[PDB]
Design a binder for this molecule. Structure first.
Ligand SMILES: [Cu+2]
Ligand SMILES: [Cu+2]
Lengths: 312, 312
């Protein structure tokens, strides 16, 4: 352990997907299915976006889910006021992307202080945008100074270019500077095909929270997808992962979202893709008969799917 | 540098995709487009598979492409005879997945020796199946003893479970043992979402060749996809990558293969997916107007595609 939790952002990051147009009822459906699956956090679009987004945040946070509902805002006093008034259990601050460091630290601490005052029980996370491309001394200076005042700090590979060893290294440095009592969140975009690998490296480096969306939907080609992330973690911690989540629900989660946003599940999608458990090579089929484990990373039944043997 | 080449395996790994049914003309079309793109190697199904596969290998190897055409076989004397007779420029041996090490080394050297004798100009690569899960002392013992006799050794993450730091570490150890004059090839499956990340780590560790297929098609959910791999490498070595390949051909490569195997390009596919360059968030759109670089990992024009702005 390697203990960690998932922050689903389907209703935040989520909404930034090109084809997403979630009704209130769509979001409630998604949130209840995630809660049933066992997801620990559900992050929702800033209430400042529209009066709509505010309402949705209000409803989601009062659904009585076991998951904590958390909203994502710019690191600003005005947005923080709106956020606390919604009743969310958490607020995820993003300090947007040079101006001096004591001032950045100043402005951050002010927002965080407002929130502690107005809503002492709300969990606060602080991230700087584009964390891995920010110059590192100043980044660590900010995180070190803000960490004593927050429950969690986050790192965001905003443009999807961080490399796995870079993510590992910077998470380790952040852990060094913030100490063992502040949680560490990773958010990574998939532009260079590293969102799952980077989330995994983040956890190996000490990260405690990973952002996912169902099918990885999000800005551009999206972020770490729930199913791909769970496949990656299941192979390493199968006992922990199967006890944490209702893994057999994955196909229904992927279907629900695909139907809502109007896409097909891709044909190679982790676990639930048409092709995810198809075998064809004769020497593979030879082995699967004696033991399917021979060419399978995990059992399809665990995730509520079946293998396919192509015997032509 | 970070110098490396791609071995496309669309016509080998490739053929093991559930829905692949390539006619001879399909393969010739694919191979000529890859050669035009600038791909360095094209790997094809073992000629032993059917008389068909043999014919296709014979044609492909005699097409007069600039790319070297290479076939993939079990590490056996009988298959090697068939392979050399096809005229391929390379033979990729796979020693299939305990029996003693001097004997494994013995059997390997015998096949390799046959090939040097019967076809001194053919390039020979040796891989052990499931390289990252083989016990490491014995694996390195085999690679160390065989390397002086081959042009290249390969590592294969056959079941798609290797982790990026594991791949980095084992490639470094292999490089230590085989010396600087033997090339090193990486083949990785995508079951845990790490095929691109692992290929990248392999190169950082000293690997010189990476297996890809167009759209990542292959057994199960496939292997490192060409487009995702090029996106990953372009962000790190843009001059090198744009000079090596005709990057603007990527959409036509992905379309061609999708059409042939009967799938849609997935909606989040690297570069050529519907959604790969779609922006929606207001603060993103604000920035893209001053500079699209602000939220884009690479320029869409480089790959012959366009961005989308969602202003609702
Ligand atoms: Cu994001
Ligand atoms: Cu393979």
């Amino acid at each position: 352990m390697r203990e960690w939790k998932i922050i689903d952002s389907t209703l935040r990051e989520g909404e930034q997907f090109e084809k997403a147009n979630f009704s209130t009822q769509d979001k409630v459906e998604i949130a209840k299915a995630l809660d049933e699956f066992g997801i620990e956090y559900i992050e929702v679009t800033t209430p400042v976006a529209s009066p709509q987004s505010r309402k949705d945040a209000e409803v989601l946070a009062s659904l009585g889910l076991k998951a904590k509902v958390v909203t994502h805002i710019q690191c600003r006093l005005d947005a923080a006021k709106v956020a606390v008034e919604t009743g969310v259990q958490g607020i995820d601050l993003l300090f947007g992307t040079g101006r001096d460091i004591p001032r950045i630290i100043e402005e951050a601490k002010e927002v965080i202080a407002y929130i502690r005052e107005a809503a002492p029980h709300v969990e606060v996370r602080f991230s700087a945008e584009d964390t891995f491309r920010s110059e590192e001394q100043d980044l660590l200076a900010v995180y070190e100074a803000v960490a004593p005042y927050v429950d969690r700090v986050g790192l965001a590979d905003t443009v999807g270019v961080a490399t796995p060893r870079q993510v590992y290294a910077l998470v380790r440095e952040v852990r060094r500077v913030v100490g063992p009592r502040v949680d560490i969140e990773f958010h990574g975009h998939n532009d260079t095909g590293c969102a799952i690998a980077n989330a995994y490296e983040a956890i190996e480096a000490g990260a405690t929270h990973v952002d996912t969306t169902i099918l990885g939907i999000g800005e551009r080609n999206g972020i770490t997808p729930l199913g791909g992330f769970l496949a990656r973690m299941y192979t390493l911690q199968p006992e922990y992962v199967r006890r944490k989540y209702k893994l057999e629900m994955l196909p229904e989660l992927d279907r629900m979202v695909a139907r809502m946003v109007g896409v097909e599940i891709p044909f190679n999608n982790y676990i639930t893709g048409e092709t995810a458990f198809s075998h064809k090579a004769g020497m593979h089929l030879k082995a699967i008969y004696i033991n399917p484990e021979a060419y399978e990373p995990y059992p399809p039944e665990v995730f509520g799917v079946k293998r396919k043997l192509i015997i032509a």
